[PDB]
């Protein structure tokens, strides 16, 4: 049975700096106030914040982050999300540094329902180099899904108002989750987005602290003080030329609240990665993010892959998580066996292809909400901003970027300004 859904989605984009938790919270309440006063404001059903939204990101040592960690149901990030959720009767999702009872540290995203109750806590699964500075653990459950009960957000197709409830299957992916494992795995594994497709996820939520490529990441540069000093001068000039302090922009809010301006489809060029034009998205990253969701994108060649059964072995052979992942540290050939083929195996995909269909996502819908922070840290690291909302429409009739019309760019913030974007998103699910 086809069910139409309408969700009001609000994304908050922040430039948090380490040691400014109280200031970032104040700016957050300032943004939310401005949002409610917008001419085309409507109450959000869900509000999504970035990775480490209140704390800053580039922690260099366990001792430096310890004053900012919290239990999943205590502390500034939880209390903020609970207050927001009660004031807007919505789901609120925020990234925060977590500590558990056993003194283990994670990079996490907590989820609070409209009643102010914490219904989920997701831990980052693929870690970035920075997490290794402070002993961050991998999520021992690997990628996870969870239900979100939305009240009065759905209707049958011939009905005229969104008066029915719906439980959507959701998944959170925190920044690096979208990348090849450790940047070492094959690009074409598309681990996170394959997982979402495999598990028929409908609402994909991504708190991020994702870099613009002007950032200094070359390891030899980072560990040669002379090369590093020279590199830092380059970034300093790039911020100064933009009329910004080195940490980037704070407190000047770009608001796109309830408008329907879509983001222009653009191929990545040798200029789309430049840190200029703070109110425009980084289209190098927008295109790359879209590419990392390849299994959700229409691609003509899948018909040949399926016809020739070219991916059957890849499909049967793929494991739930990378073999060396935390998942298996404590969790555990259908061809040459008398075990039957289970439903779950028939749900599995590689490159978007399943055992049963050339393109498993074909004819389906999914919504992607990406909340990326902006600003700069350590004089080396420039975050890409460009938070946005996307619809994968599952339609046929093959570019690997924003030119591909099976994805809809419902709206983005700029690469450099704090702010907020609200979009009403309409899509279908089947029940």
> Which residue ranges are tagged as binding site for L-glutamine?
51, 57, 176, 209, 211
Known binding-site residues equal 51, 57, 176, 209, 211
Q: Angle between the 21-36 and 76-88 helix axes, to the nearest 10 degrees?
A: 10
Q: What is the DSSP string of 266-306?
A: ----TTTTSS--TTS--HHHHHHHHHTTGGGS--TTHHHHH
Q: Which helix (H) or strand (E) holds 227?
A: helix 225-241
What sign for the dihedral angle of Cα 280, 284, 285, 290?
positive
Q: Residue 135 — left, alpha, or beta (φ > 0 → left; ψ -120 to 50 → alpha)? A: left
CA distance 18 to 377: 9
Q: How far apart are CA 430 and CA 153, in angstroms?
A: 14
Give the whole-angstrom CA distance, residue 47 versus residue 93.
6
- Percent helix / strand / coil, the chain, rounded to 5: 25, 25, 50
Count CB-CB contacts under 10 A for residue 43: 11
Q: Which two tokens stand for residue 236?
A: 């300093």
Contact 118, 112 (CB under 8 A): yes
Nearest by Cα to 257 from 92, 36, 421, 34: 421
Q: How far is CA 286 from CA 13, 18, 100, 189, 379, in A?
A: 15, 26, 34, 19, 23
Is 183 exposed, middle or buried (CB count within 10 Å of its CB: 0-12, 13-18, 19+)? exposed
**In whole angstroms, what is the distance from residue 397 CA to residue 406 CA?**
8
- How many other C-beta atoms can be found within 10 angstroms of the C-beta atom of residue 210? 26
The rounded distance, in Å, linking the Cα atoms of 324 and 332 is 12
**Beta carbons within 10 angstroms of residue 341's beta carbon:** 11
Residues in the chain: 431
Give strand pairing partners of 419.
13, 254
Structure tokens at 292: 């990392």
Nearest to 319 by CA among 204, 200, 191, 202: 191
- Helix intervals (H) in 48-187: 62-65, 76-88, 129-132
Give the CA distances from residue 37 to residues 26, 33, 92, 361, in Å, rounded to whole numbers and listed in that order: 17, 7, 20, 39
To what resolution in angstroms was this structure determined? 2.0
Q: Which of 162, 194, 191, 170 is nearest to 179 (CA)?
A: 191
* Ramachandran angles phi, psi of 387, nearest 5°: -50, 150
If phi over 0 gives left and psi between -120 and 50 gives alpha, with beta otherwise, what is residue 251? left
**How was it solved?**
X-ray
3-class secondary structure, 200: coil
Q: Residue 182 and residue 126: Cα distance in Å, rounded? A: 7
Distance spanning both ends of the chain, measured CA to CA: 5
Comparing CA positions, the residue from 285, 249, 278, 294 lying closest to residue 388 is 285
3-state secondary structure of 137: coil
**H or E segment and range at residue 319:** none
């Amino acid at each position: 049975t086809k069910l139409l859904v309408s969700l009001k989605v609000l994304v908050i984009q922040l430039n948090p700096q380490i040691g400014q938790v109280d200031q970032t919270i104040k700016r957050t309440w300032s943004i939310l106030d401005k949002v409610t006063k917008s001419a085309t404001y409507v109450k959000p059903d869900i509000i999504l914040f970035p990775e480490f939204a209140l704390t800053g990101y580039s922690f260099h040592a366990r001792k430096d982050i310890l004053p900012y960690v919290t239990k999943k149901d205590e502390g500034p990030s939880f209390e903020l999300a609970k207050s927001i959720s009660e004031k807007f009767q919505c789901y609120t999702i925020i990234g925060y540094p977590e500590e558990d009872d056993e003194q283990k540290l994670y990079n996490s995203a907590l989820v609070v329902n409209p009643q102010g109750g914490q219904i989920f806590n997701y831990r980052k699964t693929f870690l970035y180099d920075t997490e290794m500075n402070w002993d961050c653990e991998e999520n021992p459950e690997g990628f996870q899904t969870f239900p979100m009960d939305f009240s009065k957000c759905a209707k049958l197709s011939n009905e005229d108002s969104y008066n029915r409830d719906v439980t959507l299957k959701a998944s959170i992916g925190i920044s690096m989750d979208l990348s090849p494992y450790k940047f070492m795995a094959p690009f074409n594994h598309f681990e996170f987005s394959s997982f979402c497709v495999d598990n028929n996820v409908e609402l994909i939520l991504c708190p991020m602290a994702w870099l613009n490529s002007t950032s200094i990441t070359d390891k030899q540069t980072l560990h040669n003080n002379s090369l590093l000093e020279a590199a830092k001068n380059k970034i300093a000039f790039a911020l100064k030329e933009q009329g910004l302090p080195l940490a980037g922009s704070q407190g000047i809010y770009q608001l796109k609240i309830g408008d329907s301006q879509r983001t222009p489809r653009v191929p990545s060029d040798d200029s789309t990665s430049e840190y200029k034009d703070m109110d425009e998205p980084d289209m190098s990253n927008v295109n790359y993010w879209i590419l990392r969701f390849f299994p959700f994108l229409y691609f003509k060649l899948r018909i040949n892959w399926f016809k020739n059964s070219s991916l059957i072995e890849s499909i049967l052979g793929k494991t739930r998580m990378p073999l060396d992942h935390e998942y298996y540290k404590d969790k555990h050939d259908l061809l040459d066996s008398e075990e039957v083929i289970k439903d779950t195996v028939l749900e599995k995909t590689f490159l978007g292809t399943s055992l049963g269909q050339p393109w498993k996502f074909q004819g389906k819908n999914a919504i992607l909400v990406l909340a990326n922070r902006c600003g700069t840290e350590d004089g080396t690291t420039i975050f890409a901003g460009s938070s946005g909302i996307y619809k994968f429409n599952g339609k046929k009739p093959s570019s690997l970027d924003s030119l591909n019309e099976s994805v809809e760019l419902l709206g983005n913030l700029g690469k450099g300004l704090e702010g907020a974007i609200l979009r009403e998103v309409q899509f279908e699910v089947f029940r």
